[PDB]
UniProtKB/Swiss-Prot annotation, chain B:
Primary subcellular site in the record, as a coarse category: cytoplasm
Miscellaneous notes: Present with 12000 molecules/cell in log phase SD medium.
Part of the intact protein present: 2 to 243 of 288
Protein name as annotated: Probable proteasome subunit alpha type-7
GO cellular component: nucleus; proteasome complex; proteasome core complex, alpha-subunit complex; proteasome storage granule
Modification N-acetylthreonine occurs at: 1
Family per record: Belongs to the peptidase T1A family.
Swiss-Prot record, chain C:
One Gene Ontology term, aspect cellular component: endoplasmic reticulum membrane
Phosphoserine carried by residues: 68
Record's protein name: Proteasome subunit beta type-4
Family: Belongs to the peptidase T1B family.
Note: Present with 21800 molecules/cell in log phase SD medium.
Signal peptide limits: none
Origin superkingdom: Eukaryota
GO biological process: proteasomal ubiquitin-independent protein catabolic process; proteasome-mediated ubiquitin-dependent protein catabolic process
Keywords recorded for this protein, A-Z: Acetylation, Cytoplasm, Nucleus, Phosphoprotein, Proteasome
Main localization, broad class: cytoplasm
Subunit architecture: The 26S proteasome consists of a 20S proteasome core and two 19S regulatory subunits. The 20S proteasome core is composed of 28 subunits that are arranged in four stacked rings, resulting in a barrel-shaped structure. The two end rings are each formed by seven alpha subunits, and the two central rings are each formed by seven beta subunits. The catalytic chamber with the active sites is on the inside of the barrel.
Location within or outside the cell: Cytoplasm; Nucleus
From Swiss-Prot, chain G:
A Pfam family matched in the record: Proteasome
Gene behind this protein: PRE6
Signal sequence extent: none
Disulfide bonds: none
Name of the featured protein: Proteasome subunit alpha type-4
The UniProt record lists the keyword Phosphoprotein: yes
CDD domains attached to this UniProt entry: proteasome_alpha_type_7
From Swiss-Prot, chain H:
Gene giving rise to this polypeptide: PRE9
SMART domains the UniProt entry points to: Proteasome_A_N
Protein name in UniProt: Proteasome subunit alpha type-3
Localization: Cytoplasm; Nucleus
Family, similarity comment: Belongs to the peptidase T1A family.
Lineage: Eukaryota, Fungi, Dikarya, Ascomycota, Saccharomycotina
Task of the protein: The proteasome degrades poly-ubiquitinated proteins in the cytoplasm and in the nucleus. It is essential for the regulated turnover of proteins and for the removal of misfolded proteins. The proteasome is a multicatalytic proteinase complex that is characterized by its ability to cleave peptides with Arg, Phe, Tyr, Leu, and Glu adjacent to the leaving group at neutral or slightly basic pH. It has an ATP-dependent proteolytic activity.
GO cellular component: a single term: proteasome core complex, alpha-subunit complex
Species whose genome carries this gene: Saccharomyces cerevisiae (strain ATCC 204508 / S288c) (Baker's yeast)
GO biological process: proteasomal ubiquitin-independent protein catabolic process; proteasome core complex assembly; proteasome-mediated ubiquitin-dependent protein catabolic process
Keyword check for Cell inner membrane: no
Misc. comment: Present with 17100 molecules/cell in log phase SD medium.
Gene3D superfamilies in UniProt: Glutamine Phosphoribosylpyrophosphate, subunit 1, domain 1 (3.60.20.10)
Source species, domain of life: Eukaryota
């Protein structure tokens, strides 16, 4: 009964007792390093909000892109190792465009997240990558089969349909409040304020139009990223309501 | 010396005494399985198994442990389940291929060699582990009955009587007496095979045999009155 | 599809003939002091010219040096021959005219569709290759100057259009466009 | 202590003959949610307890259909379940195109067995951490197969895999004599299955959301009852 | 994967990957030792019971239900330099500690002294909540009853706390200890959903909360996002 | 069919199906990766390099912030050439897009 | 966890990728400043060296420029791959490579080399500057061995980076960026003196390496 | 952090490459000096035995091409593979452009090859460093050196191998930019004599070559002795 | 070796205002010899989709076989959702277009109801090209059928079925390859219905 | 190598072949002996393995191919196109010559790093 080192965590294919795969679990620890990303699904559209996390004031915060457009009615918010994300987004963009070419129909986001997870699943048998993705992304999109929906795609290869989800740094705090505040009758306008309100608590620095950017999915407008002017107004309205 | 620390963490490595310990460890995996025996008769062979019943939920007719590699070959193994069934299917593939090409059932000595090469091939490289099953197999061909027993090391020999599993020392000791006492008819061995399993030992008794005279060279199980007679003798 | 080349004492004069109507065909600028004019099959000939431009440009960026016209001509010859190895030959004719700054002397080279390189005082391809030698050989001289060369080209072009072009000059000042044929 | 040195990968046998790296994979199923499978002579039923990542998240899919005549449930690693289930579905469809036969339930469970046992013999790859409960109905009739990641496929009248699956197994054994005789009564068979899975519960109760049920038979192609359709059986 | 790398042979397991206090591995002098600054203004007698935990068990003490509030923090420093501080919390008559255990940043030496100070200044009803990678199942323990089998044991900070309650100065204090099975390096332990259910509904017996309401609060904090749940919410079906 | 360039934009009056359909797929990817509309010169160049590799008198028109109004014709043999006037239902092209007249 | 790229540390970052960054921090200093319509790149520079066959600022194209910090050998090869892509894009396509495109490709190469345990990732961080074709908006990008590329108004990488990235942070205002070639050059020079070669790139493929910077040094030194 | 060449240590340094550089420090010193009208290459033949064929045994100095030469320090076995690659690469340029390859391009290619061996797990760094001396129209006479790490630097007078620091110091104090090829020869002899660990610098231990006027002349031992006494060594 | 045969016959598709119709003869032919008198030349692929590939039978049967497999894969990937007529059309185009330099010699037609419920009929060029058409016929006697219909159409699903009967009855009268049996598939929101009628034997 | 900018075209420049002139569709007219001769050795080797499978079983071909893959993949020398010394022994070509041995057969894409990427598929 002596204390000795255990190497059930270093390897990626090494099972630990009780069947835990740690390297996948450590991959989630990388997500917690990434900037906070919020997403709320409801009627009239889905809304996404991401902390930009300016490393230095000289960094072009206007060019930090944690939200990327995959299809004219689908949007993705990413958190974690952005270098790994670019591989996933490129695959997601190709699959959505390929589906239109093959079927002349907008790709069902439930199928799109399935395709993306098939890529993050590739660290084992579909292998193309040595280690699991260190990025967890949050897909918000609208398909005319299931309505405005939000999907969270973990690096483990499993996706969940989320009414409201927060990932990245401070996700535990954000999720706890989303449980207190989310409801079915949540309109889009208050959802945008809600997303900003959630960002207020978990963002370590001051909330401002320069370090936070919102986006939404609407049938008429599609995926659009809000301009700095609108976000400033919403932030202004938020603190007035508080 | 039975551990060989330092030279036992990798396959295809010779210890200072010339032993490959990974193969020896695979032997110990065999020794933990249900004891299985095989008796070579003048007209055929007999196989017996102490299938330890786990639960009533198992379908009795589909829960069979004495595999049939080919119509004329019977196979029974003790050790790791994944390796035993993996080897049987590969052996099943070889038997079909030989029949496909040469239009005749594969001889038992030839079948054993093909399995021996496959089992031995996993003791050459460190990327694979030796099979953890000792397989007793046999049948009947132009040259008569044959009983073979290959080890995880890939070594196989012809046997007049074979035994494996946890109940190995007792079965082998009694099996030696049977050969010494009657140096058998396919009928008699079935009763003797049942006796050895009961002596070796909740468990059920599974028996199969293949003889030229009583089954025209085909492998069939023991059922109905014959079974009960063997249990009564035991 | 006519391409002409005249090597005057201090420059090289390249000329080229022009559903879709416009108001720089069959030519590519490989280097500030090198110009390449080509004629032959449409399509198969422009990709080769584009590819050569990339390689020569790549060399210039890599070394920050102006590859000599002689080296450029050799590179084209090998690539053209290497292109034909695994396919049926294609009608292509390339004129490489450049000013060698290191030697401070103009140079003109002719490359046939089979990948043979000739250093020439003057050259031509197409319909211009049947009679125009009768004029250039009689009137061309080594010490001819630029302004004289364009009178010869203007003269030459005149015979071409009787029996029947955008003009560029390469000099120490670099490539230059001309309206006076 | 000594287990740490010999559990590095699925290629090293321990001095006692144990192959730890694949034992852990079998233990990974206990992390998954409980699923229960049982069958009568003419009908086979699957009952699964889905789980959600959070109260704002939809319950994870746990039952899949490979064709109109058979399907399966999942328990263990999600990524492995994704690979095995779709790979099996790639085999349902392949046979019809070239041969136009329904791939029999017994063949479906065994073609997958070879897939799992390779990973337990080679370095780099890892044994699958997912167990399957395959139910179908073909010419032969009802079928219920439990696939373990160690390449062990067993025909079963009823079984349960996942967290706290022992309780459901005990109930099924206590009631094997009953639900087998529930023939031609699909509604009653499901109620027995729902009762069977209920014993595995600790805190969470049955709801139309978390509970999923599947059934297949001579008059019932593979149907999945989820949502409001499950209220009656609760 | 045709072959296994010849060079890939693990370093011997007798040594742990513990943080290196000083770069001077060739130091031949008595190493400096940590100090612990327990705040003296804490009115300990006001609290009838004390709870000692590591951060991985935070979800068991909801801010939303217990009305948790701070009273201060412990300070620890080390010259070679390192400085760490750990907040002290309470609710009702209960004094609570969370150390923020870490395997990479924090060496076990810091936990040892904190165990010394905590026990040297509390020597109330001691409640010790912990985890161990060497226990098959959950264990309920006290000073006069041992449930561990010989193979099993407890290591890390909780071992540090239990050591002082059993041996060393101020030994013999009455304590009730709960350890749930877990895996991973110190500060990153993972607990199964089965353990979490067994864990809240048992500590509620001693702490005395309304079990159903207490469980309802705890599961949300356990499962929504936490270091203890990790990938287990989506890595498994 | 014909098209020409003018100060106010471009006027257009009147296997190939897929290639144009497929090309619409690639421009979508380029419009995504670079987040900016693919220029006419590029689009014509992509098409020219393809019809060459698979030896379809396709034409290309557009109006870009920097490129402005340009017309490019792509011959079935891979010949690519710019055109002020092209000749071989009226449309008008502006920076905001085409207008159906 | 330290000795492989394919292993995540328990806290959730790959140490081996991080260790490549310290190699960059050991390299020679590089600086970059974005003006209103220009970009300025400054670099940190024995007795017997042949100074006539040496420029740390290598241009990837007529309009694009690329400085670097870290292992020189790795940079010389990363530059070559970028140069080929610039011409290949100019060949397969007609327009020259966008500055954002080149840094994305260069970062991809660095990111690509991180996808195997048998390859050493480039221990070089690039500082790409230039103007988009037919555009007047200066663009400056930075790439890292990890493969992350970012757009910066002003950045410094290599030896004495934190001290120089603090001087720029307080002297450079995103709302009051320098609006003259001299102004940005003075800031770049002042940036380097806190510890000279200066390169200026201007729209329409006008790249010039400044000479006689002593005037700015003398002017800045007096102030 | 030194078992393989594909691992960065916490300090961000490659120990395997550093060890390769240390290997060259134990090799015979090779010194190259560029004069106003030519270049001089010299090398200390460390492996010495009177039974060794001092003649026709060029091991330090090799001819890559007309108007180019290299002095080798370190593992002689590794050099031969790179040298043959350089010779092939030089002729490919001539076969392609009909022009003699510039020295800068040849050095760049070789250094890139050596760099690649420090970037692959199964390839160890080349334990060799070169001194390239050559002449081309772009820059005329130029002198280079390259390390196992795969990075090269231009030089006027450089010494590589054992006791490089001592030899380099002598070059700095004595090197005048306006010297002749002759004066470079005396300096090259002078620097080695004060740097060699041997009691005296005899011809059998020494090797030479020079590029001037363009002819490259690798000196036979007969004239190496003549120049040695002429210099008074 | 010639890899391409011929089987004759004819198919016809009509896009009613609401309903859709696909018809074809049942006779299989090789150089004046009747291979068989009843081979189903028109197929139902589900999802209110009826498909028929005329011309070379071995090319036609393969195309429908692959298309049917694609439908099954579409169901698996899209939660068993119905396949729209437009989606199927482009899917078939890729199948046809996937063998350009060795193409199917089949003039195939798919009939069904578009999203809004109106009749839909798509005819595919052997190299893939398709266009939405109100009515279309293909095969040997196609030229003898379309002109007659156009007179009487350019209507319910019981009076068009009269014209198709007469149209094929007229074609069989003057054309030898026209079959000795008529298959008609009727697509409506109710579903797909198969009707068979007899024609001249010789 | 496909173009990075567009993943549907060959990279004309990096693929140094004499321009895009050697287009894909045109590499169809070939010498009658080219296809048969290019992969003649492969056909003989595979045929030999089939006979081993028929007679000696699947084990022998598995052992032969596994040894060759061990030799090939553990041998990386980007400065030599010559076959490995141990490759000849396994193939039993250690005392044989062929035109492929006598005649084993650019500034841009012949660098070592090109083979490193292809060797590892990075």
């Amino acid at each position: 009964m002596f204390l000795t080192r255990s190497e059930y965590d270093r390897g990626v294919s090494t099972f630990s007792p009780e069947g835990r795969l740690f390297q996948v679990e450590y991959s989630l620890e990388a997500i917690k390093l990434g900037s906070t990303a919020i997403g709320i699904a409801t009627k009239e559209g889905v809304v996404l909000g991401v902390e930009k996390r300016a490393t230095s004031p000289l960094l072009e915060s206007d060019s930090i892109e944690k939200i990327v457009e995959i299809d004219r009615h689908i949007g993705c918010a990413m958190s974690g190792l952005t270098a790994d994300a670019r591989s996933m987004i490129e695959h997601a963009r190709t699959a959505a465009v390929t589906h239109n070419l093959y079927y002349d129909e907008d790709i069902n986001v439930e199928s799109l997240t399935q395709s993306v997870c098939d890529l993050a699943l590739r660290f084992g048998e579909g292998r193309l990558m040595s280690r699991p993705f260190g990025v967890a992304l949050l897909i918000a999109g609208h398909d005319a089969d299931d309505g405005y929906q939000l999907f969270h795609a973990e690096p483990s290869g499993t996706f969940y349909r989320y009414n409201a989800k927060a990932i990245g740094s401070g996700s535990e705090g954000a999720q706890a409040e989303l449980l207190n505040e989310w409801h079915s009758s949540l309109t889009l306008k208050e959802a945008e304020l809600l997303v900003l309100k959630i960002l207020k608590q978990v963002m370590e620095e001051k909330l401002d139009e320069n370090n936070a950017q919102l986006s939404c999915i609407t049938k008429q407008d599609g995926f659009k990223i809000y301009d700095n002017e609108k976000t400033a107004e919403l932030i202004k309205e938020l603190k007035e309501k508080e | 010396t039975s551990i060989g620390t330092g030279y036992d963490l990798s396959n295809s490595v010779f210890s200072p005494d010339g032993r490959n310990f990974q193969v020896e460890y695979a032997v110990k995996a065999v020794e933990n399985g249900t004891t299985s025996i095989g008796i070579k008769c003048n007209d055929g062979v007999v196989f017996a198994v102490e299938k330890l019943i786990t639960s009533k939920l198992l379908v009795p007719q589909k829960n069979v442990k004495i595999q049939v590699v080919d119509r004329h070959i019977g196979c029974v193994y003790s050790g790791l389940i994944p390796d035993g069934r993996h080897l049987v299917n590969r052996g099943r593939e070889e038997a079909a291929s030989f029949k496909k090409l040469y239009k005749t059932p594969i001889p038992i000595p030839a079948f054993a060699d093909r399995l021996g090469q496959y089992v031995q091939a996993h003791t050459l490289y460190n990327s694979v582990r030796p099979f953890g099953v000792s397989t007793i197999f046999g049948g009947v061909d132009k040259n008569g009955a044959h009983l073979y027993m290959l080890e995880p090391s890939g070594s196989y020999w012809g046997y007049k009587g074979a035994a494996t599993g946890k109940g190995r020392q007792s079965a082998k000791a009694e099996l030696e007496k049977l050969v010494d006492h009657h140096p058998l008819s396919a009928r008699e061995a079935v009763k003797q095979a049942a006796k050895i399993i009961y002596l070796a030992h909740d468990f059920e008794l599974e028996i199969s045999w293949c003889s030229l005279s009583e089954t025209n060279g085909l492998h069939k199980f023991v059922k109905g009155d014959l079974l009960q007679e063997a249990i009564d003798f035991a | 599809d006519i391409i002409l080349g005249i090597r005057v004492q201090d420059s090289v004069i390249l000329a080229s003939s022009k559903g879709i109507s416009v108001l720089d065909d069959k030519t590519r600028q490989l280097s500030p002091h090198t110009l390449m004019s080509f004629a032959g099959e449409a399509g198969d000939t422009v990709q080769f010219a584009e590819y050569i431009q990339a390689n020569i440009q790549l060399y210039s960026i890599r070394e920050d040096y102006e590859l000599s016209p002689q080296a450029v001509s050799s590179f084209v010859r090998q690539e053209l021959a290497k292109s034909i190895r695994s396919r049926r030959p294609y009608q292509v004719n390339v004129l490489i005219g450049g000013y060698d700054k290191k030697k401070n002397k103009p140079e003109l080279y002719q490359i046939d569709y089979l990948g043979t390189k000739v250093e020439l005082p003057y050259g031509a391809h197409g319909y211009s290759g049947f009679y125009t030698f009768f004029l250039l050989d009689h009137h061309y001289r080594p010490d001819m100057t630029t302004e004289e060369g364009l009178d010869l080209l203007k003269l030459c072009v005149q015979e071409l259009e009787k029996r029947m072009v955008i003009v560029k000059i390469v000099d120490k000042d670099g490539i230059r466009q001309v309206d006076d044929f | 202590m000594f287990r740490n040195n010999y559990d590095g990968d699925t290629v090293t046998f321990s001095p006692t003959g144990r192959l730890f790296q694949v034992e852990y994979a079998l233990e990974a199923i206990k992390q998954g949610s409980v699923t229960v499978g049982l069958r009568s002579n003419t009908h086979a039923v699957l009952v699964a307890l889905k789980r959600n990542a959070d109260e704002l998240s939809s319950y994870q899919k746990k039952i899949i259909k490979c064709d109109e005549h058979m399907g399966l449930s999942l328990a263990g690693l999600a990524p492995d379940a994704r690979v095995l289930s779709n790979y099996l579905r790639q085999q349902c469809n392949y046979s019809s195109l070239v041969f136009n036969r329904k791939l029999a339930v017994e063949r479906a469970g065994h073609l997958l067995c070879d897939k799992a046992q390779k990973n337990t013999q080679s370095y780099g790859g890892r044994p699958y951490g997912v167990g399957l409960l395959i139910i179908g109905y073909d010419k032969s009739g009802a079928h219920l197969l439990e696939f373990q990641p160690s390449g062990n496929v067993t025909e079963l009248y009823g079984t349960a895999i996942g967290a706290r699956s022992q309780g459901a197994k005990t109930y099924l054994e206590r009631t094997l004599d009953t639900f087998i005789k529930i023939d031609g009564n699909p509604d009653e068979l499901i109620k027995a299955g729902v009762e069977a899975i209920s014993q595995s519960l600790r805190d969470e109760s049955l709801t139309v959301d978390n509970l999923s049920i599947a059934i297949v038979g001579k008059d019932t192609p593979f149907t999945i009852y989820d949502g409001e359709a499950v209220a009656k059986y609760i | 994967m045709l072959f296994k790398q010849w060079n890939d042979l693990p370093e011997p397991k007798h040594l742990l990957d513990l943080p290196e206090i000083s770069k001077n591995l060739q130091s031949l002098e008595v190493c400096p030792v940590p100090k612990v600054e327990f705040p003296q203004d804490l009115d300990v007698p006001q609290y009838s019971t004390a709870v000692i935990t590591t951060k991985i068990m935070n979800p068991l003490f909801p801010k939303n239900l217990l009305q948790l509030t701070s009273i201060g923090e412990i300070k620890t420093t080390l010259t070679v330099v390192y400085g760490f501080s750990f907040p002290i919390y309470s609710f009702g008559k209960t004094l609570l500690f969370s150390m923020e255990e870490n395997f990479i940043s924090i060496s076990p030496i810091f936990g040892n002294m904190i165990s010394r100070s905590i026990i040297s200044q509390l020597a109330p009803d001691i409640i010790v909540i912990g985890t161990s990678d060497k226990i098959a199942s959950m264990k309920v323990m006290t000073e006069n009853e041992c449930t561990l089998q010989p193979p099993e044991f407890i290591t890390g900070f909780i071992g540090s706390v239990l050591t002082q309650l059993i041996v060393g100065p101020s030994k013999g204090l009455k304590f009730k200890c709960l350890v749930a099975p877990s895996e991973g390096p110190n500060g990153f332990e993972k607990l199964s959903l089965s353990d979490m259910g067994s864990l809240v509904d048992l500590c509620g017996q001693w702490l005395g909360f309304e079990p159903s309401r207490y469980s309802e609060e705890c599961y949300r904090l356990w499962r929504c996002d936490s270091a203890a749940i990790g990938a287990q919410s989506g890595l498994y079906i | 069919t014909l098209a020409f360039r003018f100060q106010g934009g471009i006027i257009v009056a009147v296997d190939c199906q897929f290639w144009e359909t497929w090309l619409g797929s690639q421009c979508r990817l380029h419009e995504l990766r670079e987040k900016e509309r693919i220029s006419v010169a590029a689009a014509s160049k992509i098409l020219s390099n393809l019809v060459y590799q698979y030896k379809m008198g396709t034409m290309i028109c557009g109006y870009t912030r920097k490129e402005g109004p340009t017309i490019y014709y792509v011959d079935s043999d891979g010949t690519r050439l710019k055109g002020d006037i092209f000749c071989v239902n009226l449309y008008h092209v502006t920076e905001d897009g085409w207008i159906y007249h | 966890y330290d000795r492989a790229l394919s292993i995540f540390s328990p806290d959730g970052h790959i140490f081996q990728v991080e260790y490549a960054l310290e190699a960059v921090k050991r390299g020679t200093c590089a600086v970059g400043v974005k003006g209103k319509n220009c970009v300025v790149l400054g670099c940190e520079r024995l007795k017997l060296q042949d100074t006539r066959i040496t420029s740390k600022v290598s241009k990837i194209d007529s309009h694009v420029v690329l400085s670097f910090s870290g292992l020189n050998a790795d940079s010389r090869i990363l530059i070559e791959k970028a140069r080929v892509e610039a011409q290949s894009h100019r060949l397969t396509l007609e327009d020259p490579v966008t500055v954002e495109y080149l840094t994305r490709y260069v970062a991809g190469v660095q990111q690509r080399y991180t996808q195997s345990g048998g390859v050493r990732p480039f221990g070089v961080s690039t500082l790409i500057a230039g103007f988009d074709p037919r555009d007047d908006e200066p663009k400056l990008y930075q790439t890292e061995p990890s493969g992350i590329y970012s757009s910066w108004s002003a950045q410094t990488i290599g030896r004495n980076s934190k001290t120089v990235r603090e001087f720029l942070e307080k002297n450079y205002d995103r709302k009051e960026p320098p609006a003259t070639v001299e102004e940005c050059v003075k800031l770049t020079v002042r940036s380097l003196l806190e510890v000279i070669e200066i390169t200026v790139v201007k729209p329409d493929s006008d790249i010039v390496a400044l000479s006689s910077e002593e005037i700015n040094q003398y002017v800045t030194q007096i102030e | 952090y030194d078992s393989r060449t594909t691992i960065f240590s916490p300090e961000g340094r490659l120990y395997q490459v550093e060890y390769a550089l240390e290997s060259i420090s134990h090799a015979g010193t090779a010194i190259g000096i560029m004069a106003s009208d030519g270049i001089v290459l010299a090398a200390e033949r460390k492996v010495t035995s009177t039974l060794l064929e001092q003649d026709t045994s060029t091991e330090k100095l090799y001819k890559l091409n007309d108007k180019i030469a290299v002095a080798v320090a370190g593992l002689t076995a590794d050099a031969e593979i790179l040298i043959n690659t350089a010779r092939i690469h030089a002729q490919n340029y001539l076969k392609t452009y009909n022009e003699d390859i510039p020295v800068e391009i040849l050095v760049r290619r070789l250094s890139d090859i050596k760099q690649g061996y420090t970037q692959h797990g199964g390839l160890r760094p080349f334990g060799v460093s070169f001194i390239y001396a050559g002449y081309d129209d772009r820059y005329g006479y130029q002198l280079y050196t390259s390390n196992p790490s795969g990075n090269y630097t231009g030089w006027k007078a450089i010494s590589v191998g054992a006791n490089t620091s001592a030899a380099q110091t002598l070059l700095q104090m004595d090197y005048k930019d306006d010297m002749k090829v002759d004066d470079a020869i005396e300096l090259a002899l002078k620097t080695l004599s004060k740097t060699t660990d041997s009691s005296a610098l005899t011809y059998d231990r020494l090797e030479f070559a020079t590029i001037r006027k363009v002819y490259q002349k690798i000196f036979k031992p007969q004239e190496i002795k003549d120049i040695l006494v002429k210099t008074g060594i | 070796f010639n890899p391409y045969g011929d089987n004759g016959g004819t198919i016809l598709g009509i896009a009613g205002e609401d309903f859709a119709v696909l018809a074809g003869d049942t006779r299989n032919i090789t150089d004046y010899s009747i291979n068989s008198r009843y081979e189903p030349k028109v197929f139902d692929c589900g999802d209110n989709i009826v498909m028929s590939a005329n011309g070379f039978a071995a090319d036609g049967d393969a195309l429908v076989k692959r298309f049917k497999n694609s439908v099954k894969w579409y169901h698996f990937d899209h939660n068993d959702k119905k396949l729209s007529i437009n989606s199927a059309a482009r899917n078939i185009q890729h199948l046809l277009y996937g063998k350009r330099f060795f193409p199917y010699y089949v003039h195939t037609i798919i009939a069904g109801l578009d999203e809004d419920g109106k009749g839909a009929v798509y005819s595919f060029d052997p190299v893939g090209s398709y266009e939405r058409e109100q009515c279309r016929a293909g095969g040997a006697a196609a030229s003898l059928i379309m002109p007659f219909l156009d007179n009487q159409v350019n209507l319910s699903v019981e009076e068009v079925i009269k014209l198709v009967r007469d149209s094929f009855t007229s074609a069989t009268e003057r054309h030898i390859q026209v079959g000795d049996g008529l298959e008609i598939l009727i697509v409506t929101k109710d579903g797909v219905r198969k009707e068979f009628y007899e024609l001249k034997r010789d | 190598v496909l173009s990075s900018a567009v993943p549907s075209l060959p990279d004309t420049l990096r693929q140094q072949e004499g321009g895009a002139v050697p287009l894909s569709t045109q590499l169809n007219d070939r010498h009658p002996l080219e296809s048969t001769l290019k992969n003649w050795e492969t056909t003989q080797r595979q045929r030999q393995m089939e006979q081993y499978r028929q007679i000696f079983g699947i084990a022998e071909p598995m052992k032969r191919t596994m040894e060759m893959e061990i030799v090939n993949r553990t041998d990386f020398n980007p400065l030599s196109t010559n076959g490995s010394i141990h490759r000849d022994i396994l193939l039993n070509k250690e005392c044989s010559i062929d035109w492929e041995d006598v005649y084993p057969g650019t500034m841009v894409g012949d660098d070592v790093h090109s083979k490193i990427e292809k060797q590892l598929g990075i």
